[PDB]
Amino acid sequence: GPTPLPWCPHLVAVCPIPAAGLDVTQPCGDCGTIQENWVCLSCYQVYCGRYINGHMLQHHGNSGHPLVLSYIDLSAWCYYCQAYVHHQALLDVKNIAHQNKFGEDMP
Amino acid sequence: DLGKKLLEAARAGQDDEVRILMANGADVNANDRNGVTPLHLAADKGHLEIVEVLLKTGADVNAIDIMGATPLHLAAAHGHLEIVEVLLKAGADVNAMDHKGFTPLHLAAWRGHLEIVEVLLKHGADVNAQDKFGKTPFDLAIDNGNEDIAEVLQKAAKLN
Ligand SMILES: [Zn+2]
Ligand SMILES: [Zn+2]
Ligand SMILES: [Zn+2]
């Protein structure tokens, strides 16, 4: 498909933003890394990327949560579709992280 | 049953258990439910000896996981020059691409591993490859504060 997917059959599984909001500086929950982290849009835990220790991939493997937001560039990856995704539903949680991160809205 | 244990022996660097489970018939190409083989785990965590015994016993050098990462992607990202050379010698695809668009050269440049970059370029790495967002290994080196790797990649592209 196109480089960013416009629709994903797993968007339905995205859960609302918790009241706590997001913390782009939050470290991995299993190794504390602050270099390459992802967010689980289902449970909003934080775990490091593939090439750190694969702790967000291990999270997917055990919980089954499809979609994750990158605290490096705020991209949405679907482990099942194995592609990036972007849609109106994801567009909201990307502002909580962007306000948090740049103190400004997302164009 | 054995594949489960063998995967863990590779991560934990148990050169001993690897030679036990694998000797008892443990599948050398064993899988977890994300496609990670023992060879991925050896390359990721830097166990040169485990990499060499797994390859000798028939480990798929170009195996892949749910995200398209090969052992070479991992050894290149984590700076394991020795393993990189072993894998490349074993036939690893220098320009393999993960589902995000990253080649080993992307990762080595992003992560500031000057030595691996020139090895990969000597094995035929595409200095013009792009990720999904259109970024080259040059682009990643710049954005992450690795000036020296950027200059190499730039002179390699200019060669005329
Ligand atoms: Zn981690
Ligand atoms: Zn989760
Ligand atoms: Zn999907």
Swiss-Prot record, chain A:
- Which residues are noted in the entry as Zn(2+) 2-binding? 28, 31, 48, 55
Q: Which domain of life is it from?
A: Eukaryota
User: What does the UniProt record tell us about how this protein is modified after translation?
Assistant: Phosphorylated by AURKA; phosphorylation increases HDAC6-mediated deacetylation of alpha-tubulin and subsequent disassembly of cilia. Ubiquitinated. Its polyubiquitination however does not lead to its degradation.
Q: Which residues bind Zn(2+) 1?
A: 8, 10, 78, 81
Chain residue ranges for the region called Ubiquitin binding: 49-51, 77-84
Q: Which residues bind Zn(2+) 3?
A: 40, 43, 59, 65
Where is it located? Cytoplasm; Cytoplasm, Cytoskeleton; Nucleus; Perikaryon
Zn finger limits (UBP-type): 6-104
Q: What are the inducing conditions?
A: (Microbial infection) Up-regulated by the presence of SARS-CoV-2 N protein during viral infection. The SARS-CoV-2 N protein enhances HDAC6 stability during infection by reducing its proteasomal degradation, leading to elevated HDAC6 levels.
Q: Which family does it belong to?
A: Belongs to the histone deacetylase family. HD type 2 subfamily.
Q: Whom does it interact with, and what assembly results?
A: Forms a trimeric complex in the nucleus consisting of BANP, HDAC6 and KHDRBS1/SAM68; HDAC6 keeps KHDRBS1 in a deacetylated state which inhibits the inclusion of CD44 alternate exons. The complex is disrupted by MAPK1/MAPK3-mediated phosphorylation of BANP which results in BANP export to the cytoplasm. This facilitates acetylation of KHDRBS1 and CD44 variant exon inclusion. Interacts with SIRT2 (via both phosphorylated, unphosphorylated, active or inactive forms); the interaction is necessary for the complex to interact with alpha-tubulin. (Microbial infection) Interacts with G3BP1; the interaction increases during SARS-CoV-2 infection, promoting the association of G3BP1 with the viral N protein which disrupts stress granule formation and facilitates viral replication.
Chain's role: Deacetylates a wide range of non-histone substrates. Plays a central role in microtubule-dependent cell motility by mediating deacetylation of tubulin. Required for cilia disassembly via deacetylation of alpha-tubulin. Alpha-tubulin deacetylation results in destabilization of dynamic microtubules. Promotes deacetylation of CTTN, leading to actin polymerization, promotion of autophagosome-lysosome fusion and completion of autophagy. Deacetylates SQSTM1. Deacetylates peroxiredoxins PRDX1 and PRDX2, decreasing their reducing activity. (Microbial infection) Deacetylates the SARS-CoV-2 N protein which promotes association of the viral N protein with human G3BP1, leading to disruption of cellular stress granule formation and facilitating viral replication.
Domain free text: Histone deacetylase domain 1 mediates the E3 ubiquitin-protein ligase activity. The primate-specific SE14 repeat region contains seven SE14 repeats with the consensus sequence X-L-X-Q-T-X-S-E-X-A-X-G-G-A and mediates binding to valine.
Disease linkage in the record? Chondrodysplasia with platyspondyly, distinctive brachydactyly, hydrocephaly, and microphthalmia: A disease characterized by chondrodysplasia, severe platyspondyly, hydrocephaly, and facial features with microphthalmia. Bone abnormalities include a distinctive metaphyseal cupping of the metacarpals, metatarsals, and phalanges. Affected females show a milder phenotype with small stature, sometimes associated with body asymmetry and mild intellectual disability.
Q: By what name is this protein known?
A: Protein deacetylase HDAC6
Organism expressing this protein natively: Homo sapiens
Gene name per UniProt: HDAC6
